[PDB]
Design a protein around this ligand. Structure first.
Ligand code: FAD
Ligand code: SF4
Ligand code: SF4
Length: 472
């Protein structure tokens, strides 16, 4: 039908399970659209000129085109259009925060008509295509005689590997873990993204012809000059893993565990491998009171994965207001509905205890009015300082890059202050010849789709450089 039906229809997301039932299991919380409902929700588009849904999507899919090709049957052509510009569409549709990228700037969203549910239609059109064999690996026609190396198996690494293998090269990936996929499989919990689609996509990648090297750290089992001599070009996509800390009176007691360790062990125990720290360790929250520090999406993941495993009472201390939350806002409402209690504008001061933490003494800060440059300056209130009973606290402040030049044996890699190495904009080439670096280690605490775009751009640049070098 002529697809301008936002006038006489109302937006409604797919099926959801109630809160009293969500708290038990570890599966997802949403469901896939039905056919007659997807063909209706994809019809509310307006095919507007100058589509803001595409200007603000970091990978810049052709959103109106497959929204049209979905609203008229014709699902296979829609799958083609969607896949031809994005390597992991379903993963993006599942995890990408849409209220700030695409759904937050739709033209009918700016006019209080609600937003066309884009990511859910992405999921629908990209998963119903998987069941009927419309997905196939991109095996190169004529195998080109060159070899390219990458470091890391995250989103950027896998995207670059797929692009290079499609061009015709021979790729070799080098991941530190045993199950490749990066923090897509060890950072993000199960209820957000299921660990089955990730292994499905990595199996497809391996079927395309990629060679996998698990349990292979660059620092220990290799060296950057050796790999530089092996292949023709290497892509540093190792991400950021050196976490942050806090120095306060009482910050040396027991049961003060970093967030990444907790999340990793939760992912493992959901998969298996029977780590002992889940049996006898401080990485369980069965019958304890949990308190997490800092904000962001990491805080949301931690608090939810804690409230799933019992956790008689959970609290989260953010040191700003609610509207400045770094992550999305659907997960905040989800956590509130599931049982979490939030404490906005609070900063930790100390930990009271003897050998194990018994409580967290915190202060209450006040934010000034936005400055002429758009920056609020908080100041701690002198009177109100309080203490919360805490059985297990989790520090989830942030993440920073490691010291790569002093660990990759090459002290000539140019670096900024924070650790993100410098790189040109066009070719995505590192200071040194032959080596390239693009992904999350160049940006900071970005999202997945930015990593995908950086990986694709670095792949194109590496192809151009290798062709120009073997050319003459
Ligand atoms: C919805 C959402 C939720 C998010 N949740 C989180 C979250 O909970 N926590 C979080 O931290 N980020 C989170 N992010 C951020 C995002 O996941 C990452 O910034 C991004 O995925 C990292 O991209 P990358 O290319 O650096 O890959 P990464 O996955 O960051 O790359 C890590 C890989 O590098 C490998 N590696 C590391 N060091 C070495 C080495 N020396 N040698 C070899 N291999 C090495 C690791 O083993 C791993 O395979 C989230 C993003 C979104 C959109
Ligand atoms: S969601 Fe809105 S802006 Fe995006 S294509 Fe549809 S009508 Fe245009
Ligand atoms: S990748 Fe993210 S921003 Fe782009 S269309 Fe999909 S959900 Fe929207």
């Amino acid at each position: 039908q002529r697809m301008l039906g936002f006038v006489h229809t109302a937006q409604r997301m797919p099926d959801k399970r109630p809160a009293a039932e969500r708290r038990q299991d570890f599966a997802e919380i949403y469901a896939r659209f039905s056919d007659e409902r997807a063909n209706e929700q994809a019809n509310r588009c307006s095919q507007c000129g100058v589509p803001f849904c595409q200007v603000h999507c970091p990978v810049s899919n052709n959103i109106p085109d497959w929204l049209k090709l979905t609203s008229e049957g014709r699902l296979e052509e829609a799958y083609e259009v969607s896949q031809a510009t994005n390597n992991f569409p379903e993963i993006c549709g599942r995890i990408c925060p849409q209220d700030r990228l695409c759904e937050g700037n739709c033209v009918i969203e700016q006019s209080t008509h609600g937003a066309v549910t884009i990511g859910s239609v992405e999921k629908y059109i990209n998963d119903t295509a998987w069941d009927q064999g419309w997905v196939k690996p991109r095996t190169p026609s004529r195998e080109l005689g060159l070899s390219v190396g990458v470091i890391g198996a995250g989103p950027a690494g896998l995207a670059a590997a797929e692009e290079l293998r499609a061009k015709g090269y021979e790729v070799h990936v080098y991941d530190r873990y045993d199950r490749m996929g990066g923090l897509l499989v060890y950072g993000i919990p199960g209820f957000k993204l299921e660990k089955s689609v990730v292994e499905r996509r990595v199996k497809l990648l391996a079927d395309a012809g990629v060679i996998y090297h698990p349990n292979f750290e660059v620092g220990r089992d290799a060296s950057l000059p050796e790999l530089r001599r092996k292949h023709v070009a290497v892509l540093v996509a190792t991400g950021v893993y050196k976490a942050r800390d806090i120095k306060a009176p009482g910050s040396g007691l027991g049961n003060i565990v970093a967030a990444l360790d907790y999340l990793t062990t939760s992912n493992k125990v959901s998969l298996g491998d029977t780590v002992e720290a889940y049996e006898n360790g401080s990485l369980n929250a069965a019958g304890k009171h949990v308190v997490v520090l800092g904000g962001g999406d990491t805080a949301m993941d931690c608090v939810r994965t804690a409230i799933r495993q019992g956790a008689t009472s959970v609290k989260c201390l953010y040191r700003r207001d609610r509207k400045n939350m770094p992550g999305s806002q659907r997960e905040v409402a989800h956590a509130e509905e599931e049982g979490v209690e939030f404490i906005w504008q609070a900063a930790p001061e100390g930990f009271t205890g003897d050998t194990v933490v018994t409580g967290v003494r915190a202060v209450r800060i006040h934010l000034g009015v936005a400055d002429a440059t758009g920056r609020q300056t908080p100041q701690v209130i002198e009177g109100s300082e309080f203490t919360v009973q805490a059985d297990l606290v989790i520090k989830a402040l942030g993440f920073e890059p490691e010291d790569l030049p002093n660990a990759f044996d090459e002290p000539e890699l140019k670096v900024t202050r924070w650790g993100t190495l410098l790189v040109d904009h066009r070719t995505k080439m590192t200071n040194m010849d032959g080596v390239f670096a693009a992904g999350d280690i160049v940006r900071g605490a970005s999202l997945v789709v930015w990593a995908i775009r950086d990986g694709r751009d670095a792949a194109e640049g590496i192809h151009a450089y290798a062709k120009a070098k073997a050319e003459a």
